[PDB]
Amino acid sequence: KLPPGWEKRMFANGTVYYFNHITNASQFERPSG
Ligand SMILES: *[C@@H]1O[C@H](CO)[C@@H](O)[C@H](O)[C@H]1NC(C)=O
């Protein structure tokens, strides 16, 4: 779903997440993408 400033990333060991590039917070909460 994602609050303001959260956008998609991935861990090289194989896991997708969403990262707040305004604070550096990281969570698995997924939007349409
Ligand atoms: C990959 O490493 C990250 C950071 O420790 C962790 O959050 C993620 O769950 C890991 N995924 C796998 C499949 O190893």
Tab-separated table of C-alpha atoms and ligand atoms in Angstrom:
chain	number	residue	atom	x	y	z
A	1	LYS	CA	0.000	0.000	0.000
A	2	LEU	CA	2.911	2.310	1.094
A	3	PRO	CA	2.939	5.655	3.031
A	4	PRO	CA	4.762	8.797	1.645
A	5	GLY	CA	8.442	8.177	0.679
A	6	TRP	CA	8.285	4.314	0.702
A	7	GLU	CA	9.424	2.595	-2.569
A	8	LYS	CA	10.368	-0.990	-3.805
A	9	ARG	CA	13.765	-2.738	-3.134
A	10	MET	CA	15.267	-6.276	-2.917
A	11	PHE	CA	17.837	-8.123	-0.759
A	12	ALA	CA	20.521	-9.903	-2.882
A	13	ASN	CA	19.936	-13.163	-0.872
A	14	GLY	CA	16.420	-13.147	-2.518
A	15	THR	CA	13.704	-11.068	-0.739
A	16	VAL	CA	11.634	-8.028	-1.889
A	17	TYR	CA	10.718	-5.131	0.437
A	18	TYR	CA	9.730	-1.441	0.481
A	19	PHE	CA	12.120	1.236	1.787
A	20	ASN	CA	11.401	4.754	3.038
A	21	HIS	CA	14.160	6.766	1.250
A	22	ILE	CA	13.324	9.770	3.559
A	23	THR	CA	14.220	7.882	6.851
A	24	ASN	CA	15.852	4.517	5.817
A	25	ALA	CA	12.921	2.483	7.317
A	26	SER	CA	12.197	-0.910	5.563
A	27	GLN	CA	9.056	-3.140	5.538
A	28	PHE	CA	7.517	-6.000	3.443
A	29	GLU	CA	4.138	-4.125	3.037
A	30	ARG	CA	3.381	-4.489	-0.733
A	31	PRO	CA	1.397	-2.186	-3.184
A	32	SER	CA	0.320	-3.322	-6.726
A	33	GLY	CA	4.113	-3.689	-7.531
B	1	LIG	C1	17.848	-11.699	3.011
B	1	LIG	O1	18.521	-10.903	4.046
B	1	LIG	C2	17.662	-9.827	4.586
B	1	LIG	C3	18.507	-8.952	5.507
B	1	LIG	O2	18.996	-9.765	6.580
B	1	LIG	C4	16.426	-10.476	5.230
B	1	LIG	O3	15.498	-9.461	5.665
B	1	LIG	C5	15.705	-11.339	4.191
B	1	LIG	O4	14.548	-11.915	4.826
B	1	LIG	C6	16.652	-12.424	3.663
B	1	LIG	N1	15.965	-13.311	2.724
B	1	LIG	C7	16.386	-14.545	2.451
B	1	LIG	C8	15.440	-15.411	1.613
B	1	LIG	O5	17.481	-14.953	2.836
